[PDB]
Structures are given as C-alpha cells and as structure tokens.
C-alpha cells in the first residue's frame, strides 16, 4: 500500500483540487487508464485496482502506476469535539484531475488490456477511460 517513505511535514492543508491534469499521455506503455472525473484516489483504492490489473493479466507484460498517494488526510476520531488540534493521519490520497493517466500497461494485447482496466476501474471512485499511445 503505497505511501511516502519520509515526508518534510506530517500534516497537509486540505487544499483544493482545481485544473486539468499533467501526465495526460501514455508515456511508458502501449495502453493506459485515464481519469475523466476529479477526486481523491486513496492508497487502498490504488492497490486494489493494481491487484485486479495484475490478476486479469497473469505474469504478462508490465504495469506502471502514474499516480502516487503523497497527500496525508486526517480524521478526528469518533466522539472528539471540534478543535483541540488537527487530527491524525489515517490514509494517503493522490489528488486527481480530469486527464490524468493513472496506470499504464504493455506486453499484452489491447483486448486483454481493455478488460484489465475495466476491472480495475470498478475499484476506483472516478470515471475513467481507456486510452492508447499517441505518436507526435
């Protein structure tokens, strides 16, 4: 379950998630899974989609994950009042914008790849779309 090895600071501001993505083209494989929607991808979600990818394809090809959950999210536990300091880190998310390639794959045919990503996409909270490598 992906997570930064070390971070400069423990807790990050909520921030906002505006704009189109960077990492919009397939860069390492022949095929990829691209986000259409916007929203946070948690580390558990990324591992589950990856688990479903690597099983739809059995020791076949190579898989890349283009997103990293580097943003720490906090939660006050149950029955704590408001304030008294910021909560504790519970999970890690990657902020996702419309356009972001999330995973890439080669070494398999397209049709197996359309099926692998469809199963992975069911694990994610964001609309996605299949995409192919483009020349120039």
């Amino acid at each position: 379950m992906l997570q930064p090895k070390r971070t400069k600071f423990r807790k990050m501001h909520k921030g906002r998630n505006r704009g189109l993505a960077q990492g919009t083209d397939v860069s390492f494989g022949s095929f990829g899974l691209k986000a259409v929607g916007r929203g946070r991808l948690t580390a558990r979600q990324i591992e589950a989609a990856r688990r479903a990818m690597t099983r739809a394809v059995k020791r076949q090809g190579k898989i890349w994950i283009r997103v990293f959950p580097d943003k720490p999210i906090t939660e006050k536990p149950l029955a704590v009042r408001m304030g008294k300091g910021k909560g504790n880190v519970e999970y890690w998310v990657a902020l996702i914008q419309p356009g972001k390639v999330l995973y890439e794959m080669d070494g398999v045919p397209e049709e197996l790849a359309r099926e692998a990503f469809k199963l992975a996409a069911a694990k994610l909270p964001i609309k996605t779309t299949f995409v192919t490598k483009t020349v120039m």
Binding site: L20, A21, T24, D25, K34, A35, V36, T129, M136
Partner: protein, 94 residues
C-alpha cells in the same frame, strides 16, 4: 494523401478559440521558413479521422487556404485532456 482544407482565422485567442471548438472546428498554426506565421482553423472530425493513421505525423501534408496548396509537416498537437478531440496543431513547413 492528407489534404486538409483550411480557412484563415479572423479572430484569435481564448474566446475565439473556444467558439471554434464548440462548432466542430479547431485552431491551428503554420510556421517555418521565413514566411510569417499563418493561423488556420480546421474542421475537427476531418482532421481527427486523418490523424488516426500513422503516416499523418511522418509524411508531408498539404493545407489549402485561399486556394493555395501549402505543404507542411505535423509538428505538435494539443489533444483534449480526457476526450478523443483536438485543441490545436502546430504545422511546420516542409
């Protein structure tokens, strides 16, 4: 084979460019040589279908504006972030 039938842009920038992509045309630009740059608007689906082929980004291409057949190469292409559309093409002369 690739013969793009283009028109010249009368107004430029963001409003004008968005107005085009809402009308199934997209902006583009021709540069290179010592001629000045030439801003063209293309029909989207026409160019969309042709750049699906592989020999669009490798062979010489020709763009007709005002009757004049201008030969070019595809140089850079701005794709939509999350759709199979086109925002902008850079054509270099050759």
């Amino acid at each position: 084979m690739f013969t793009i039938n283009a028109e010249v842009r009368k107004e430029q920038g963001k409003g004008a460019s968005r107005r085009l992509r809402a009308a199934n045309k997209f902006p583009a630009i021709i540069y290179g040589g010592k001629e000045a740059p030439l801003a063209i608007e293309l029909d989207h689906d026409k160019v969309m279908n042709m750049q699906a082929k592989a020999e669009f980004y490798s062979e010489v291409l020709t763009i007709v504006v005002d009757g004049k057949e201008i030969k070019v190469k595809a140089q850079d292409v701005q794709r939509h972030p999350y759709k199979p559309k086109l925002q902008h093409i850079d054509f270099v002369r050759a």
